[PDB]
Write a protein that binds this DNA or RNA. Structure first.
Length: 80
DNA sequence: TGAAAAGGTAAAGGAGGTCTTAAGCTCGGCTCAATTTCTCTCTTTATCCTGTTAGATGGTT
């Protein structure tokens, strides 16, 4: 539990760094951060050390996907 | 006992309702093309879900 907690916790800075690139699309900056946190959690749940890659490369995909999906599902009143 | 005075009866005539036809119409049925619903298949999208491996790591107005 503590290991997963630390993996997510120490990468929130990465989450903020990616989430700052969509601050004018329908979601507030704080919403982008909290939606990308879910992607970071999933990335930390599916990271493979045996792949031999940096976590900052795998986590970016999940963070970006979570934020993009959140924008697609929460930016408009009449959701498309 | 005679005499009003009212009350009847039998007509003629009219008034009114009820019957009859020649002229004409229009109305429904019958057929019969000519089509709009319906109900299956048979697809075909509309909507949702999951994943993505170079590295990246604190805001703008």
């Amino acid at each position: 539990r503590r290991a997963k907690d630390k993996m997510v916790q120490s990468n929130l800075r990465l989450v903020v760094s990616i989430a700052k690139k969509y601050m004018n699309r329908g979601l507030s900056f704080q919403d982008l951060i909290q939606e990308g946190s879910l992607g970071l959690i999933r990335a930390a749940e599916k990271f493979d050390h045996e792949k031999g890659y940096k976590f900052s490369t795998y986590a970016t995909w999940w963070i970006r996907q979570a934020i993009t999906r959140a924008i697609a599902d929460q930016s408009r009143t009449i959701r498309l």
